Amino acid sequence: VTDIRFLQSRAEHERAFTVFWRAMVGLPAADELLELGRYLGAFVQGELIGGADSYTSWLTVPGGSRVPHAAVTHIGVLPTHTRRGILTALVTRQLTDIAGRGEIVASLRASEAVIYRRFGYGIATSSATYRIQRRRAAPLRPIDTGAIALLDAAASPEGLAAIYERAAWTGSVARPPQWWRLHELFDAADPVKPYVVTHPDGYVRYRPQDTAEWFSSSARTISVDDLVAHSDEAYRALVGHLLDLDLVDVIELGPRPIDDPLPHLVTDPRAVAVAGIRDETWLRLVDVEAALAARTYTDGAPVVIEVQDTLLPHNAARFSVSSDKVRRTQHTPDISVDVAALGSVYLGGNTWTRLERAGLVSAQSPGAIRAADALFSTGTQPFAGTNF
Amino acid sequence: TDIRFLQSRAEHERAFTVFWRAMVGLPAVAADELLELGRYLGAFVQGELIGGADSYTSWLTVPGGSRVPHAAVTHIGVLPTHTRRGILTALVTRQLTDIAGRGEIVASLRASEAVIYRRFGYGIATSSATYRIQRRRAAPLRPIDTGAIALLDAAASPEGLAAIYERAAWTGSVARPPQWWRLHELFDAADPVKPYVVTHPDGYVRYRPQDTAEWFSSSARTISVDDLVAHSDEAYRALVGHLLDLDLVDVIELGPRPIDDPLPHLVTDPRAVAVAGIRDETWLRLVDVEAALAARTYTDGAPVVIEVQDTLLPHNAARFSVSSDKVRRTQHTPDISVDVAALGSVYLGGNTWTRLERAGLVSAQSPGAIRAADALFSTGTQPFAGTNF
Amino acid sequence: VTDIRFLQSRAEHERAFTVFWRAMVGLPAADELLELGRYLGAFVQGELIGGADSYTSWLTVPGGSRVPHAAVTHIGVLPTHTRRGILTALVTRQLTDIAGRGEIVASLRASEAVIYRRFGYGIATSSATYRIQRRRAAPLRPIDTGAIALLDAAASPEGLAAIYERAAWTGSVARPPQWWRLHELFDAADPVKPYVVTHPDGYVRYRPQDTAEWFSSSARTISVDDLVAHSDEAYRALVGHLLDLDLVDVIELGPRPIDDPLPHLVTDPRAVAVAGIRDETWLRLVDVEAALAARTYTDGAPVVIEVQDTLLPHNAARFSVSSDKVRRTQHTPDISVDVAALGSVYLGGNTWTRLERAGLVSAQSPGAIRAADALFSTGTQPFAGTNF
Amino acid sequence: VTDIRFLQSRAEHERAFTVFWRAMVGLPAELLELGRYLGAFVQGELIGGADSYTSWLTVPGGSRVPHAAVTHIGVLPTHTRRGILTALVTRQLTDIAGRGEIVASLRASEAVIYRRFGYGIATSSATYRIQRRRAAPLRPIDTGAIALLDAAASPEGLAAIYERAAWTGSVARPPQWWRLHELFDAADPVKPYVVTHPDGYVRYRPQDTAEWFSSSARTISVDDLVAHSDEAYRALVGHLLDLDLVDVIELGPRPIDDPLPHLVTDPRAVAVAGIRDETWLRLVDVEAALAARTYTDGAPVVIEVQDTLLPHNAARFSVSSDKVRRTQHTPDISVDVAALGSVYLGGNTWTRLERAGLVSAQSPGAIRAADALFSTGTQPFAGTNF
Ligand SMILES: CC(=O)SCCNC(=O)CCNC(=O)[C@H](O)C(C)(C)COP(=O)(O)OP(=O)(O)OC[C@H]1O[C@@H](n2cnc3c(N)ncnc32)[C@H](O)[C@@H]1OP(=O)(O)O
Ligand SMILES: CC(=O)SCCNC(=O)CCNC(=O)[C@H](O)C(C)(C)COP(=O)(O)OP(=O)(O)OC[C@H]1O[C@@H](n2cnc3c(N)ncnc32)[C@H](O)[C@@H]1OP(=O)(O)O
Ligand SMILES: CC(=O)SCCNC(=O)CCNC(=O)[C@H](O)C(C)(C)COP(=O)(O)OP(=O)(O)OC[C@H]1O[C@@H](n2cnc3c(N)ncnc32)[C@H](O)[C@@H]1OP(=O)(O)O
Ligand SMILES: CC(=O)SCCNC(=O)CCNC(=O)[C@H](O)C(C)(C)COP(=O)(O)OP(=O)(O)OC[C@H]1O[C@@H](n2cnc3c(N)ncnc32)[C@H](O)[C@@H]1OP(=O)(O)O
């Protein structure tokens, strides 16, 4: 009755866009936004009623390695065909196809947080929203900003793509040409054009809010939609530019890392308030063995992790993880966990102790948890400054 | 201007009114019930007491579980008629030197303003979070065993809850002396809404219903959890599971809680748990840096040499070789340079070396020096106190 | 000093539109949206300074009969000519002209509730606005939905007009071609296009709200502007479709009947909240005898209602009303009421007991009020769902 | 394991109160009728309960039927989802039947609890906000019989005025109810004004008194308006509209069809600020309830009632203005007892419940004939909570 196959014609590609938009209901150019050969379709009695797509991408794992990543998106089923196992059919077929392509991880941005964990996706990174009261944000230590250059209207999508390409922070994802084309359209839809300030090692985009009432007796606020900084000097210089921007009362940064050292840049840490925290990267480990081997660890003793994976039985095994070697093992495990929770830990956005506390990790010794956290610990919280 | 310790009870009573004046907006009990007799410092100009700073004999749990001698600093304040004259600096300098002589190695406080104490070496070492849970959306991801849960609402005593709290082992946890419990006896008496107290063999939870006059209103029946003590993973799930299953409750507000509280991982809908706010908590001041670094545990990494800057306590201004095996003073060239305030921020695991280096508070001489230091100091849980003073 | 005549030129029709817009102050080709030979103009010293218009329409009265109805609208006088009796002159001529056309009722939508009762208009229907918390709205009984069809971009204004034409609910009014052309203009101006879902016996139009901030932690809301259901099965199927939309958090229905059985469709009636109730149909009985005879009654004993009418003395008489016959009588009345309050009861939107409680009905015999409610009682609250 | 019995000592009744308060969680901190409180005991400890009061309820036609005012229902959170409430409700309803009472009603804390037991939403209440400056009377309103009785009001005197209540949906206010409201009035520092009429009274309290003499909207709140006559109703409301310092008058709870908008020249001065379910009605004896109410001079209709908890009501009833008896004739209408309760007081019609899928018709005119019989002129309303 229901057939799941890859889309193959421009007519099928265009219909999948209409189907995906319909399922999203409230989402605000034709097929120059897609990558040919990765769009799955769900057909009942002939008509296309759902689908799931992905893009060839990479993902930066702890240690800087850039792993093959499938950026899953465009998932949706028409309301006339929901609750029939169609998404499950799409996701199972998609992950198997992602595996055959040599890709090691897949990630998405969930429209609802109750959908994808049953398929092995785990919340691996989170994002924060900061509101800075600029009048209270004098820098604790001097900030240079000498290399700052204004590029407001002269900025191009090709120039910002060149700066972003050298992104090295953990959790960062590829921004293909199709992603920049999509944001060319978003920029055209907003009448307020964004300011672009650059540094030799980064840039920052910001837009004024309620401009019709700028001179009012309220908080003139700007909104930063992208902050790319490949060096500590660039991070401080770019942030320092905002703290020194005249006429600005409130600076809103979002999405930003949950451990962004904004409170440590100012004499008054309370000038920086966290206005919200949200789940970001839903990571699905497609090849668990290859994923664990692509990431780096600390000089600890090896720990054996038994992973449970129902959709991909190839990952259901025991792995000895160490800074020296990652191998399949038959030794008794130190930790047993499902692939979804392993994905939550994989990028460093969660620890083994906290997932065990929630009841998602089974330990054989109280110090097995400590040993595993000693290996997997990272210095920065992972963060994907990009949505798709 | 004379800075001396208070001695007579009249001076202790006057220092409380002086502290209340400095706080301006703080909400009848003898001062001796809430004070430690030999620990209150006073600031005198002419005969008049115009400021002071106090502390309590306490402990603090550092990474590794060790319970370190800790000075719970509080009651700090100067009258507005004597501010900007160096009086607080004289109080803090005398207080920190006295804390050192008592053999206590750390001091912590709760700052009324975030712009006061970093100049004295205090660093934000822990933070607290506020969660709002939409109970209808918070069905447990895995089944939660609540059979050991017992209702103890009116039968709870300050002495009985103190016995459960004493077994606190989480990093950042601080002592709750009898004076702390006496103070919260008064806060409970002032509030007409009495709190529910639900217990588990390894913990307890206190919660209070909000706007009771409009309880049956359209919607948004909220409860407020002011204390969640759980010494076990099973106790943690049972106590939270008790909250998620409470009938008639629409919104559950937890605060203050650890910033890494695994509430989003307990429920099928992580977005049923929303972070409503994050605030600085522990302002930590390392009084004996060497003894503090030696009391905590580290991972099996290579040693790192940290050069510490300390202006108030030059005894700490030195170079320390930090490793899981030994912590000693060294003359070797350092791998990392930091002031004592930022070292305090990292000490409990609430900050990493990379993020402080990014803010310009850490100077590295090798690229991997930061990575090596974070490998040693990293911890699995964010530090958290859950108690104020 | 003041001349009242019908407009006859397109230049006059265009100015009457400018006068009406000026009188409305804050309201957002005109001959395409107008019906000629029905627009009255008020001329002072030659210049057009006010007017009153109407459309040839019908109105569904209790029992299903479709009576000749004058859809009055476009009433307005310039602020430089108010409080001079011009509206009273406009309304008197209009109602007399409506009477000569053989039309028996007139209705309008009042901009202010203090204007039209002095002319015999009474509030005959009211409308409600519902907000449904979708997560709490599981159906009490299973609702089928196989006959539901998505028709979003394939919908035509002509097709929905064909579905609306079968309207049989009490209070429903004609939607002339001019009305649909007017709503073509509203739909073209809004960049957000509406979803159109159909059933063999009805349809429903809905629009997503704040689409720019759809994925944020704020309740994703849709707004239903039209719900047409000619059968209980169509009503349940269409509403059931809304309750099953996967990404929707809040459903707003409005305007809807004040007795819409939404709370009885769900296990949690409090998932449906009434966000407001407002007067809708201002009904004016032009031919009281013909109106009373066109509607149906219950098998009760006749009651004699004495109607007071100052503008139209043809209605100032006593009428013996029963399920069998409606006649003029000289017998002593059982009930005395002005035509304005009779209009309020005429569609079933009010009862005789409550209007007597308000002091608008006088009873001359014991039990006359009780008897009158038995005849005039209806099972459904009247409702138009259409504005003009 | 779990034992369900009636309480027998005041010590048990008092703990049942604390257990009820515990289950209610956030309810604010003698008041009982002995011999009507059911308790749930596991190993000698009381962990749940359900209580009721001897009361009456005004059904269409004015008849005052024996009514069980259900309240105090609650189970400790350590013993929920084990069938204890179902055991309490089953025992309670069978006990209500044995006492000769024909209806039971309650005020539900959650709307998702009691329908499975046959309770139906029979009345709803509304909250009105009147912009007093815009509320001039449409017709002149007399008020010479209005008398200020503010501090001279007594619980015993006001209870005598309420006793003459004849509107459909009204319930008895026992002495225990007035004692409970004596306690609420003593706790509130703002004492209520009490204005009387020969046929009614009205209680009102000023809102936010601390900022009265200079703010945006000085509002008063009317918590009780009892009026046994059209003249008393207009006089009492007219008194409120003529209070010189009041900007906004808030009435609640009031009937959903309160003719306030028809009293003023500006109907939009009266806004509906909210609508909430009120009476959850459970027909304990369907036949006797159908007989106690009045109907119009229509043709008989046969109603088939479904009732799982009380099979005595599972039958077919011929309803007419002359006679209500059990019959074996094929029914014209089929309904479960919960939905029949929704219509019983006139707060719902057969057409709207059928449209919601709660009524099945066997004849085309059966729905229309049933509405002809059951129609009432006033929406039912219980100006009282318990
Ligand atoms: C990467 C992105 O683009 S995120 C965008 C996701 N898309 C949307 O939100 C569009 C709107 N929604 C939809 O299109 C659909 O509801 C989908 C795709 C989310 C789900 O499609 P379905 O065909 O209904 O899924 P399926 O039948 O396989 O359900 C599998 C299980 O997940 C559950 N489930 C699926 N979707 C949801 C949901 N939205 N909320 C809660 N539970 C869900 C089902 O109950 C079922 O559980 P069960 O096995 O215990 O019965
Ligand atoms: C643990 C606790 O209880 S926290 C409670 C702290 N108490 C209060 O906040 C009460 C209100 N404030 C006060 O009483 C006083 O302002 C105090 C105690 C904070 C400071 O007392 P002072 O006598 O003015 O301090 P002192 O003169 O030594 O100032 C030292 C430096 O800190 C600065 N400083 C002190 N307080 C503040 C403040 N509230 N805001 C900003 N800067 C301050 C001074 O400007 C000075 O800086 P400088 O050396 O560059 O000139
Ligand atoms: C169907 C629709 O389109 S409704 C749209 C109605 N139009 C508007 O609201 C536009 C703005 N207003 C206007 O154009 C004018 O004020 C109108 C049309 C409301 C009234 O026109 P006028 O020529 O001033 O009316 P007119 O002089 O005949 O007044 C008759 C009586 O009604 C009263 N009246 C008229 N309008 C109002 C009002 N808005 N508020 C209160 N009373 C009014 C007058 O006071 C007068 O009472 P009186 O005899 O006791 O002195
Ligand atoms: C008249 C008055 O006083 S109203 C006051 C009502 N009391 C309260 O609201 C206090 C808070 N709630 C409680 O104490 C309890 O939840 C009670 C009393 C409502 C229910 O007690 P329980 O022992 O859990 O009821 P019980 O186990 O018999 O449940 C019977 C059914 O109703 C359902 N149910 C019972 N209470 C609820 C509720 N609050 N929400 C949703 N469903 C419920 C159960 O799921 C069960 O359904 P099922 O047969 O499909 O599995």
φ/ψ of B339, rounded to 5, equals -85, 160
φ/ψ of A257, rounded to 5, equals -60, 150
Alpha-carbon span A366 to A352, nearest angstrom: 11
Residue A212: HSE in the Cβ half-sphere, 13 Å Cα cutoff: 1
Which of D283, D384, D386 has the alpha carbon at shortest distance from D342? D283
Alpha-carbon span B25 to B6, nearest angstrom: 24
Side-by-side strand order, sheet with A250-257: A2-6, A40-44, A47-60, A66-77, A105-108, A272-285, A121-133, A250-257, A221-229, A202-208, A195-199, A149-150
Alpha-carbon span B50 to C162, nearest angstrom: 86
C-beta A102 within 6 A of ligand 1 = no
CB neighbours (10 Å) of residue B52?
28
Diameter over CA atoms, chain C:
70
Whether C208 and A26 have beta carbons less than 8 Å apart is answered as yes
User: Percent helix, strand, coil in chain B (nearest 5)?
Assistant: 30, 30, 40
* CB-based touch D/A (3+ pairs, under 8 A): no
Dihedral of CA atoms C37, C38, C42, C43 in degrees, nearest 10, equals -10
Q: Is A161 helix (H, G, I), strand (E, B) or coil?
A: helix
Sequence-distant contacts of D113-117: CB under 8 A, at least 24 apart: D113/D85, D114/D89, D114/D280, D114/D282, D115/C140, D115/C267, D115/D338, D117/D86, D117/D89, D117/D93, D117/D282, D117/D309
Which of D168, D53, D61 has the alpha carbon at shortest distance from D101? D53
CA-derived radius of gyration, chain A: 23
Q: Is C247 helix (H, G, I), strand (E, B) or coil?
A: coil
Looking at the DSSP assignment, which residues form a beta bridge with residue D91?
A: none
Whether A297 and A323 have beta carbons less than 8 Å apart is answered as yes
Q: For Cα atoms A128, A129, A131, give the angle at the middle one, nearest 5 degrees.
A: 140
> In chain C, which residue's Cα lies nearest the Cα of A276?
C217
Q: Which two tokens stand for residue C28?
A: 């957002």
C330 touches chain B (CB under 8 A): no
Buried b (16+ CB within 10 A) or exposed e, C323-337: eeebbeeeeebbbbb
Alpha-carbon span C350 to C344, nearest angstrom: 6
C-beta B83 within 6 A of ligand 2 = yes
Cβ contact (<8 Å) for C351 and D266? Answer: no
Which of A104, A107, A109 has the alpha carbon at shortest distance from A127? A109
Select which of C39, C116, C164, C319 is catalytic.
C116
Cβ contact (<8 Å) for D26 and B215? Answer: yes
Strands C335-338 and C303-308, how do they pair?
A: parallel
B247 touches chain D (CB under 8 A): yes
Q: Which two tokens stand for residue A174?
A: 């590829």
Alpha-carbon span D120 to D340, nearest angstrom: 8
Alpha-carbon span D294 to D374, nearest angstrom: 8
Q: What is the DSSP string of B253-322?
A: EEEEEETT--GGGTBS-GGGEEEEEEEEEEEEEESSHHHHHHHS---S---EEEEEE-SS-TTS-SEEEE
Chain C residues in contact with D342 by the CB 8 A cut-off are 264
Per DSSP (E only), the strands in C200-348 are 202-208, 221-229, 250-257, 272-279, 282-285, 303-308, 317-321, 326-329, 335-338
Residue D87: HSE in the Cβ half-sphere, 13 Å Cα cutoff: 20
CA-derived radius of gyration, chain D: 23
* Single-letter amino acid code for the residue at D240: L
Looking at the DSSP assignment, which residues form a beta bridge with residue B313?
A: none
Per DSSP (E only), the strands in B135-272 are 150-151, 196-200, 203-209, 222-230, 251-258
Looking at the DSSP assignment, which residues form a beta bridge with residue C227?
A: C204
* Single-letter amino acid code for the residue at B20: W
Q: Is A51 helix (H, G, I), strand (E, B) or coil?
A: strand
Looking at the DSSP assignment, which residues form a beta bridge with residue C273?
A: C131
Cβ contact (<8 Å) for D352 and C379? Answer: yes
Chain-centre distance for alpha carbon B342:
17
Sequence-distant contacts of B48-51: CB under 8 A, at least 24 apart: B49/B6, B49/B11, B49/B14, B49/B15, B49/B18, B50/B18, B50/B78, B50/B79, B50/B81, B50/B82, B50/B87, B51/B18, B51/B22, B51/B77, B51/B78, B51/B79, B51/B82, B51/B87, B51/B88, B51/B91
Alpha-carbon span C144 to C137, nearest angstrom: 16
Chain A residues in contact with C241 by the CB 8 A cut-off are 79
Whether B73 and B55 have beta carbons less than 8 Å apart is answered as yes
Which of D117, D253, B136, B245 has the alpha carbon at shortest distance from C271? B136
Q: Residues, chain D, total?
A: 386
Strands C66-77 and C105-108, how do they pair?
A: parallel
C-beta D112 within 6 A of ligand 4 = yes
Sequence-distant contacts of B21-26: CB under 8 A, at least 24 apart: B21/B77, B21/B79, B21/B80, B22/B51, B22/B76, B22/B77, B22/B78, B22/B79, B22/B80, B23/B77, B23/B112
Query: Which one of B219, B248, B269 makes the best mutation probe of the C interface by having the most chain C beta carbons within 10 Å?
Result: B219
Alpha-carbon span A146 to A200, nearest angstrom: 11
Which of A108, A128, A93, A96 has the alpha carbon at shortest distance from A59? A108
Looking at the DSSP assignment, which residues form a beta bridge with residue C66?
A: C60
Strands A149-150 and B2-5, how do they pair?
A: unpaired
Alpha-carbon span A109 to A126, nearest angstrom: 11
Which of B117, B110, B43 has the alpha carbon at shortest distance from B73? B110
* Single-letter amino acid code for the residue at B63: P
Q: Which of B142, B301, B371 has its CB closest to that of A379?
A: B371
Q: In testing the pocket of ligand 4, which one of B247, B249, B250 has its CB within 8 Å of the most ligand atoms? A: B247
Q: In testing the pocket of ligand 2, which one of B113, B115, B280, B282 has its CB within 8 Å of the most ligand atoms? A: B113
Q: Which two tokens stand for residue D54?
A: 């001897």
Active site residue D386: yes
Alpha-carbon span D165 to D188, nearest angstrom: 27
Alpha-carbon span D359 to D345, nearest angstrom: 17
Q: Which of B277, B356, B358 has its CB closest to that of A235?
A: B358
Residue A274 makes CB contacts below 8 A (sequence gap 6+) with: A128, A129, A130, B275, B277, B278
Chain B residues in contact with C135 by the CB 8 A cut-off are 136-137
φ/ψ of B374, rounded to 5, equals -65, -35
Q: Is C124 helix (H, G, I), strand (E, B) or coil?
A: coil
Chain-centre distance for alpha carbon A203:
19
Sequence-distant contacts of D323-332: CB under 8 A, at least 24 apart: D324/D287, D324/D290, D324/D291, D325/D287, D326/D287, D327/D302, D329/D302, D330/D302, D330/D362, D331/D302, D331/D303, D331/D304, D331/D362, D332/D301, D332/D302, D332/D303, D332/D361, D332/D362, D332/D363, D332/D366, D332/D369, D332/D370
Whether B209 and B237 have beta carbons less than 8 Å apart is answered as no
φ/ψ of D27, rounded to 5, equals -80, 140
Residue D179 makes CB contacts below 8 A (sequence gap 6+) with: D30, D31, D155
Whether A201 and A229 have beta carbons less than 8 Å apart is answered as yes
B243 touches chain A (CB under 8 A): no
DSSP state of B82: G
Q: Which of D26, D78, D274 has its CB closest to that of B149?
A: D78
- Residue B347: which H helix or E strand, with range? helix B340-347
Ligand 3 residue neighbourhood (C-beta within 6 Å): C 23-24, 72-77, 82-88, 108-112, 114-115, 118
Chain-centre distance for alpha carbon B144:
29
Residue A252 makes CB contacts below 8 A (sequence gap 6+) with: A129, A130, A131, A132, A221, A222, A223, A224, A275
The domain ranges of chain B are 1-125+281-285, 126-280, 286-380
Experimental technique = X-ray
How many angstroms separate the first and last alpha carbons of chain A?
Answer: 31
Side-by-side strand order, sheet with D360-361: D324-326, D315-319, D301-306, D333-336, D360-361
Q: In testing the pocket of ligand 2, which one of B44, B81, B83, B283 has its CB within 8 Å of the most ligand atoms? A: B83
Alpha-carbon span A341 to A344, nearest angstrom: 5
Active site residue D201: no
Strands D270-283 and D147-148, how do they pair?
A: unpaired
Neighbours of chain B (3+ CB pairs under 8 A): A, C, D
Q: Is A298 helix (H, G, I), strand (E, B) or coil?
A: coil
Side-by-side strand order, sheet with A326-329: A326-329, A318-321, A303-308, A335-338, A361-363
Alpha-carbon span C363 to C367, nearest angstrom: 8
Alpha-carbon span D78 to D46, nearest angstrom: 12
Centre of ligand 4 from the C-alpha of residue B248, in Å: 10
| Cα–Cα separations (whole angstroms), residue D312 to B219, D286, D328, D342 | 38, 8, 15, 19
> Tokens 């063995």 identify what position?
A289
* Single-letter amino acid code for the residue at D340: L
Residue A301: HSE in the Cβ half-sphere, 13 Å Cα cutoff: 7
Residue B167 makes CB contacts below 8 A (sequence gap 6+) with: B202, B231
Centre of ligand 3 from the C-alpha of residue C115, in Å: 6
Which of B389, B384, B379 has the alpha carbon at shortest distance from B130? B384
Centre of ligand 4 from the C-alpha of residue C256, in Å: 32
> In chain B, which residue's Cα lies nearest the Cα of D74?
B247
DSSP state of A25: S
Diameter over CA atoms, chain A:
70
SS3 readout for chain D: CEEEEECCCHHHHHHHHHHHHHHHCCCCCCCCCCCCCEEEEECCEEEEEEEEEEEEEECCCCCEEEEEEEEEEEECHHHCCCCHHHHHHHHHHHHHHHCCCCEEEECCCCCCCCHHHCEEEEEEEEEEEEEHHHCCECCCCCCCCCEECCCCCCHHHHHHHHCCCCCCCCECCCHHHHHHHHHHHHHCCCCCEEEEECCEEEEEEECCHHHCCCCCCCEEEEEEEEECCHHHHHHHHHHHHCCCCCCEEEEEEEECCCCHHHCECCHHHEEEEEEEEEEEEEECCHHHHHHHCCCCCCCCEEEEEECCCCHHHCEEEEECCCCEEECCCCCCEEEEHHHHHHHHCCCCCHHHHHHCCCCEECCCCHHHHHHHHHCCCCCCCCCCCC
Which of C95, C87, C137 has the alpha carbon at shortest distance from C273? C137
Ligand in closest contact with the CA of C246? 1
Q: Which two tokens stand for residue C136?
A: 């709490």
CB neighbours (10 Å) of residue A94?
26
* Single-letter amino acid code for the residue at D106: L
Looking at the DSSP assignment, which residues form a beta bridge with residue B77?
A: B52
Chain-centre distance for alpha carbon C328:
29
Alpha-carbon span B306 to C24, nearest angstrom: 76
Alpha-carbon span C128 to C133, nearest angstrom: 16
Centre of ligand 3 from the C-alpha of residue C87, in Å: 6
Residue D84: HSE in the Cβ half-sphere, 13 Å Cα cutoff: 25
Q: What is the DSSP string of C336-350?
A: EEEHHHHHHHHTTSS
Looking at the DSSP assignment, which residues form a beta bridge with residue D49?
A: D39, D74
